[PDB]
């Protein structure tokens, strides 16, 4: 029978009373695979002020000794990782590999966030005033709330929740509707080591209800949010009434620039290797390939074979397809009008194309050619496994159409020319460029989107220090 | 006659062509001092496609050109403090000595953040891949703009304008409706060294128009704001719709704690000496008060014959006084109400009190006590020269009650025990605590306010990032 | 039979074929425990050349595998924490408690020093050639070489080859002649986890000898040690003839300021908590004690009080204990000389003060009276558990008498004013000043000593930067 | 009539009353233009007598107060630019133009320098103890030295005396033997201005003498020294009696790599433009030239071809030349006897190669050939404007053959391709990498060498710090 999820807040799961329920299901199967509470403000509340009663005495603990509690976190998920993985298998629709991983990654990510501990500081400044200093302490915002999205939600949790853990915060997470189970699993783990009661907590429901309420209340610090714009500008807008600060990574359009003197197979492999990181849909994976003319014929080619290999499916019964459904019926259609709408425009179907009708969402691995920097399929979040593949004469036109968007987290060029890739790279107005390999971010570097990409960013030092504020004492004699 | 200001856009001033005016009044002598246009959005848009035309090559400079530039506009300032003095005073209504140091403290700010040319930098980070590189650039964000209040009008130019250009940023400010002189001058300083046109735009009109398209301008990488929470909320909300970064400082109710222990002569002068830096108005101004039993009779008999002392009015024709006028009749009646309404709480007027009816806008030193936590008169922007005192027993008394607070920019001690200083400022959630001494924030500090006193900062190496960006590049071999 | 160790070279133990053996013996019964090879010079290159062969490709590994390494190392050290500690504490004499913390610490260090894997940068400077890029990277130096003293042996192995390690270079360690059974130990466990060839050697033999070689050899970077001033002057001086860098760290005497408005308890506590924490012998233990006349009366009876219950013995046959033997006969020796001068010169002997002549080498806790700056006991590393108490009459006269030193590695004060706390800071010339509480440096703090006291320093960033070095790369275009 | 130069102790030159005189002479004419003390033991002493009662004072000014008196001195130098140039060129025989840009690069410098006052700062450290902070502190060393070489010795006055300075430290400075006489200049600026006496000290003599006991003297925190690896070791050497710190310069041999697919343009002028930078004599100048067989045959002709047009001469009559002379006769016959000795193990002279006999010392800009890495002329400190020129097959070769060397200063590669860049980049062994461009380190880099070539380093922020030391506060509650 579907499982009925409850709650976690103030150190305790709890049962939902409420009379409506929201059903998550398998991008798969397309069956219900469990339910989960349509929480309200008041649920996003309950656990905020719990967050806020927890906050004092959190921070007041040496940063190691918080360090050791996300180290038995980290523990707890490698114990269970098989199982966590196989959730996020079930209801994000990802391959296998790529579920292993994430479980891997985050509990690694965890463990290197935990290090910060002893090693975040403050500064002592000279003054102009004779014997006088300015200390600059960094002191933790309070409590804070995390609005993940379908995408890598396993990993979403870590990245938001162990930056403000290790700093002394506390947090409020809302993992997405659609995939709630990994984040319930993640609740039981914090359970079962006994963090201390609100620091950690779990409230489960739908964005415009619980996600709004994690953004507009008085009592939080900072909302974190990962997913598209249009939530971001919801948020936003929600946090300015009380000059709430706010953390986003809203994605893009990631562009990737092939030269000729580009090692073809690399950037083939490259490209094919990221791109699909799940079904597709990932926003740091190439889905604006600019290639030049005089390789353009080649790289072509090889790109279409390397895609028809990418055979798909159900992830729980193949462990050898390349990538699995869509996370649910909106993103399969909106993928199809767009990929209908840009052949209309001149986009030229060179494989896949056409959107398989049963149970489940799959859409073909889609390449799009002939395609111009003037069509709509290059201003949208595509979400689909689509590629379009627009050519260009020179790296000023490259870097041109690539800058060319509203979004400015990730992107990526194939080059080995000395003047080539530091051309592009003191050209491209990207929070990332990728030289020569596939775009996958670096948990000691620091993702943050330019434009509407993003405001604040995450991991590594900077990702860290998100999550601190400063005090500036100046103590005279 | 009142003169009629033009804007200044692409490197030359352009003469507003509209029917409408907004008359610029001196708050001593209530006379109109000259005239600025009633700008609207399209004055600002012409501003920012100049200031976009511009940042690229404005970047490609190398920074210590940019500071070069800078160091020719402080210059010219000092050339013409007196001049610019003279603005301020009439327009603002602050006293001639407080004009003066702030003409000298902004040239030696612009001077000081000009330093940052070869100082700011980047990191390369170890990275796991067998032979890759991560360098992590600091890129500039594009355009910026300034919407700035009344008080401190001319450093907050500077504040603003200097950081934004060092980094390699253009900039569009937008002085406010009432204190627009000092920022022409400014203008005109700029013009005469002949900086690069459109990376120093200034556009004159109103917050609602000028200041509302200022944030809501797609081609706008950050808008920077000081003022009240309420501008700050519909500067953020705006801001949301194209996921711009925002630079707020709101400011708020300044909290000064005084211990038994403390050296009664300092802080009596220290709270006094601050206070009324302009005619009171200054947020970062002690405007909460808190005494213990032990110290509180003899410090507030100190205090009010210190207040006496205070005299007011015109600014222009007496350096002998203590205060100005306040910035307008809006601000006049606010004070009156706020007061009335306090007395009516409980509140014990023990000096002024009653609002002065004639020419100009002036508001006696006005001195509350029996006053309590809970009145009103401790949750909002008092704006006047009143000073609210609340007694209390203990210390953590003292910091809960300055804690109490929807604003945490500003805060102070004084007192002479080791362990009460450490224990005040590990407690105080303050942006800044001055300890035995007046409140003024360093150049190379960091003006932040915790909850709705802001978002981001100022001054320092903090303030100068807060204009950069990073690009974190992973060249693989 | 006293086992005989072989050398640690080149990822395998060898056997030494020389003629002559160090015996090494127990402090407390004086027997011999073991004997090591009485090494040269040329066993002292063979470790070096093997250290160079594999510096190229243990620094090619990514440092995130070298911190792996470097964990596994630790996991060692646990997992045979109480074999380690018994021979820490049966050839170094110190009590059971002491050697199982050292233990425990050292692995606790080596893992927080496998932490900086990721988190050591370089940096990206301005440059103000137009469009040049000034990259900073941080490189190792190659091979380095520790020259290891008697006290905390085991983990003076971590704080050098831990920090080095990480960094990508290799080393070579000469442990104490008197104290090499932990480090033979320690190589063991580098054995057994298979840490790669090189990277880590153990050379056996005296300073003279093998330590002489591993500060004079042209292929060391630079040569970590440390010990007493002299042999920090004699391994710089051979240094010098290849520009080799050092690390010294040559303790001193640790001062300590008694205030009358000081925690008469803890004062007491802290320094008798301290000054033994072996023997005595540690060089950060208070060993000169300044107290003022107003509390003198008082602080000496309690102190006096404390330390006769300070009972010596045999640390094996003694968990009840709080002071084991001296390492040996020079030192006892050294120790009542001293005294005896010292009594000459006016000290008046308190407690304690007479040689005990018997099996194993002890010195009864003493304690010196009116002891004058002036007095010889103030100008030597005493050694012994010998403790002079100087009184003085004002906050500047403690001062200039603590800054009356060659040595300025540790100092302490007890006070309870934030004025005399924040005064003593910036009068005392140390490398470290502890306020209210006892000496013992933390992992992340920075050991280094002022004057005659040190070079370079230990423990936290900027004692793993000791092992890294600059190289700076001008890219133009 | 040859001037008697004094000697600038404790704010006030003083007449030397000794016997002895030293000769100053002008290597172009070769006749007596000054005479300076041939100081001894005991003035140094006077001089650091001074610099200790002085540097109390000057560090509790504020650093803006120092970075004051730092700005007067450059506006000193520039106010006599031209006359501190012709001293410059008149003793140290460098051309007119470089003694020009040498005096504005070093007026620069100190401003550059005194830009730190409000930047250097210590750090605020996360303790593991409930309740306790960590502040480390950034302060001065004391008295620190400077002994300096004839080549750039106006500018190596400021690099040492800047930073010590800005820093809170005093200094007492040697000037070369040879070129006393910008050092005497710059004591008289120091003199006009005011510098509170002391702070800056200056004492002629030679290095045998005065130079040691300006790094024997107990008194010296630190002695900065830059010149030959011999008087390094020395140096070295005498400083470890006292564990006293150096910060050594002794230049080496700067190699160069010139690949074929590099700018033959470029690398012919960049080479050229370098090397003769004086006279040749620079150490950062291109002393080792490795060029790859497909390029080596046009690479030696536009060489050969461009060398020819450097012309020699007295730098004051010729301002159309490219060379002045020699330092000295030492100098020079050392050129001709390596030079000699190069010739007859293979070297194959083809252009210059015979010493000038006539009024002062010149040397032709020699060429050598078929050099092979053997070669002595390729292990020793050159110092005439000779280059030798080494053929190699791959890069590989070409990085080792300029890692193999007891010098790791400088160095410089001439390619265009991305793995070629990044591949020497990380394989070469130097403080420094030119990648397509001359040899001019900046003011903001950190000039620093690795093996022989030093020991800590200069300019930059890392340049600042070498005058810094730390201390460590633990403040517990
Ligand atoms: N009503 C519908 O049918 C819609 C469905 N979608 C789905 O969302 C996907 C977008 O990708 P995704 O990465 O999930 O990113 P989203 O932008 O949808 O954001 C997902 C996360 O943001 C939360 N959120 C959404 N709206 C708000 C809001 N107004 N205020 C606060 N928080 C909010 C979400 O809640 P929650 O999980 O409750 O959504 C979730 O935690 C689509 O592909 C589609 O599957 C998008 C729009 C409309
Ligand atoms: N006796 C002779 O004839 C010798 C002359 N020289 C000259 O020195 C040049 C080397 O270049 P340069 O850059 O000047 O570098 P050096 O290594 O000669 O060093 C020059 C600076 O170091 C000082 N110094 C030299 N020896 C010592 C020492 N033992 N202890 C402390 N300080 C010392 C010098 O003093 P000072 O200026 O007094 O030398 C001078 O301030 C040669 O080309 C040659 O002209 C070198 C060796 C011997």
Chains 1, 2, 3, 4 share one sequence.
């Not at 967050?51 to 269970?80: D, H, V, Y």
């Not at 609005?147 to 700093?167: D, E, G, S, V």
């Not at 994605?251 to 197979?265: F, H, Q, R, Y």
């Not at 111009?372 to 689909?384: A, L």
Request: proline share 4%; with cysteine; hydrophobic share 45%.
């Amino acid at each position: 029978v579907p499982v009925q999820h409850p709650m976690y807040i103030d150190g305790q799961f709890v049962t939902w009373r409420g009379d409506a329920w929201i059903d998550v299901v398998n991008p798969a199967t397309e069956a219900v695979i469990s339910r989960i509470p349509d929480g309200q403000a008041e649920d996003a509340r309950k656990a905020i002020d719990a967050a806020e009663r927890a906050q004092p005495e959190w921070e007041a603990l040496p940063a190691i000794e918080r360090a050791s509690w996300l180290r038995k976190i980290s523990a707890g998920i490698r114990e269970r990782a098989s199982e966590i993985s196989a959730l996020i298998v079930e209801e994000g629709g990802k391959i296998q590999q790529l579920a292993e991983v994430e479980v891997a990654f985050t509990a690694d990510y965890i463990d290197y966030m935990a290090e910060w501990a002893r090693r975040y500081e403050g500064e002592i400044i000279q003054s102009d005033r004779p014997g006088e200093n300015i200390l600059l302490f960094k002191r933790a915002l309070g409590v804070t709330t995390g609005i993940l999205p379908w995408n890598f939600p396993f990993f979403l949790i870590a990245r938001k929740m162990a930056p403000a853990l290790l700093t002394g915060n506390t947090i409020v997470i809302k993992p997405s509707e659609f995939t709630p189970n990994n984040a319930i699993a993640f609740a039981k783990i914090v359970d079962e080591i006994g963090l201390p009661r609100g620091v950690f907590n779990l409230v489960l429901g739908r964005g415009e209800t619980v996600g709004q309420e994690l953004a507009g209340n008085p009592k939080v610090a900072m909302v974190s949010m990962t997913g598209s714009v249009s939530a971001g500008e919801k948020i936003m807008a929600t946090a300015a009434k009380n000059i709430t600060k706010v953390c986003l990574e809203l994605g893009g359009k990631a562009p990737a620039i092939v030269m000729d003197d580009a090692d073809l197979e690399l950037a083939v492999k490259a490209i094919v290797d990221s791109r699909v990181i799940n079904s597709g849909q990932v926003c740091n994976c190439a889905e604006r390939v600019y290639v030049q003319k005089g390789i353009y014929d080649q790289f072509v080619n090889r790109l279409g074979e390397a895609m028809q290999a990418v055979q798909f499916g159900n992830p729980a019964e193949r462990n050898d397809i390349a990538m699995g459904p869509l996370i649910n019926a909106a993103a399969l259609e909106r993928v199809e009008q767009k990929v209908a709408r840009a052949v209309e425009e001149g986009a030229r179907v060179a494989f896949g194309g056409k959107a398989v009708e049963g149970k489940g969402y799959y859409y073909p691995p889609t390449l799009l050619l002939d395609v111009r920097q003037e069509m709509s399929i290059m201003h949208e979040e595509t979400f689909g496994p689509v590629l379009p593949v627009v050519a260009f004469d020179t790296l000023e036109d490259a870097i041109s159409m690539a800058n060319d968007s509203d979004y400015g987290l990730t992107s990526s060029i194939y080059t080995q020319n000395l003047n080539v890739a530091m051309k592009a790279i003191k050209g491209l107005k990207f929070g990332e460029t990728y030289i020569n390999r596939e775009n996958f971010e670096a948990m000691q570097g620091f993702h943050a989107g330019w434009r509407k990409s993003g405001i604040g960013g995450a991991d590594g030092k900077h990702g860290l220090h998100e999550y601190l504020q400063t005090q500036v004492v100046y103590l005279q004699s």
